[PDB]
């Protein structure tokens, strides 16, 4: 996360950390949607261009963490993966269209003051909240600047959703209806962006009607980080809700 700040403890209890077992490595962010299901970006698990194709046994997820590194004994929870489900139409070849994956944990996690699921949007939420100009919130332990350091505490940044034509004209990469972009425009007085390593993390919004947080997007891709005239791209969670439901109902 670039130009964000340290999160308050328990501010994002659905935050999940995707960890490679060997060598030990922080791969991406993810989010808790139930006691057995974690949502993340497909490219965090499968990306052939980078010779990346992790299987269940190669990974572990960490839930309830605040610091990056510090062992938060009996607060954080480490879970094994029972199964990985990547969207069948995930386009790793061209533009990361449908950059989404689900991970089912071997055992249900116990919720706590630091571990709690986020809501997934329904039609009404998507229609009312995913509008240009409204701000959402992105969190992650990814890069603090465009590079190639890393934060010691989870970072958070609030960013406004950008009009689709502007997202489209800001890049030569083909954008789709399964993505949305966010970030401030040049000279608006504020900056900020997700960055490498933040993928899989949630872009959430708080409903003004019921006080609940909904995960509207998944950090997916960008070009550089926090560059003027460029915007971060996110997987449009509601556009892919039907697939999410299908997997959870079927397993």
């Amino acid at each position: 996360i670039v130009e964000g700040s340290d999160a308050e403890i328990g501010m994002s209890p659905w935050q999940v950390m995707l960890f490679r077992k060997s060598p030990q490595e922080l791969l991406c962010g993810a989010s808790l949607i139930s006691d057995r299901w974690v949502l993340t970006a497909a490219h965090c698990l499968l990306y052939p261009p980078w010779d990346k194709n992790f299987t269940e046994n190669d990974l572990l997820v960490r839930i309830g963490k605040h610091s990056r590194t510090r062992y938060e004994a009996n607060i954080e929870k480490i879970s094994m993966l029972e199964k990985i489900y990547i969207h069948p139409r995930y386009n790793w070849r061209e533009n990361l269209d449908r950059d989404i994956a689900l991970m089912k944990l071997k055992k249900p996690v116990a919720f706590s003051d630091y571990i709690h699921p986020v809501c997934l949007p329904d039609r009404e939420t998507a229609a009312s909240l995913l509008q240009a100009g409204y701000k959402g919130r992105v969190t992650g332990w990814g890069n603090l600047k465009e590079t190639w350091g890393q934060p010691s505490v989870l970072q958070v940044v609030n960013l406004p959703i950008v009009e689709r034509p502007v997202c489209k004209d800001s890049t030569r990469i083909r954008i789709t209806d399964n993505m949305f972009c966010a970030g401030y425009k040049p000279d608006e007085g504020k900056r900020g962006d997700a960055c490498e390593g933040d993928s899989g993390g949630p872009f959430v919004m708080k409903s003004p009607f019921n006080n609940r947080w909904y995960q509207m997007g998944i950090v997916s891709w960008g070009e550089g980080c926090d560059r003027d005239g460029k915007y971060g791209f996110y997987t449009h969670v509601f556009r892919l809700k039907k697939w999410i439901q299908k997997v959870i109902d079927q397993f």
Partner: peptide
Amino acid sequence: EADCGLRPLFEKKSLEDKTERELLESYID
């Protein structure tokens, strides 16, 4: 929706985090 999206240390305790107001005000601006 059960209990989804209501944070034990914030919504459940009627406490606002430091910047959520920025998000709510953005629905206007």
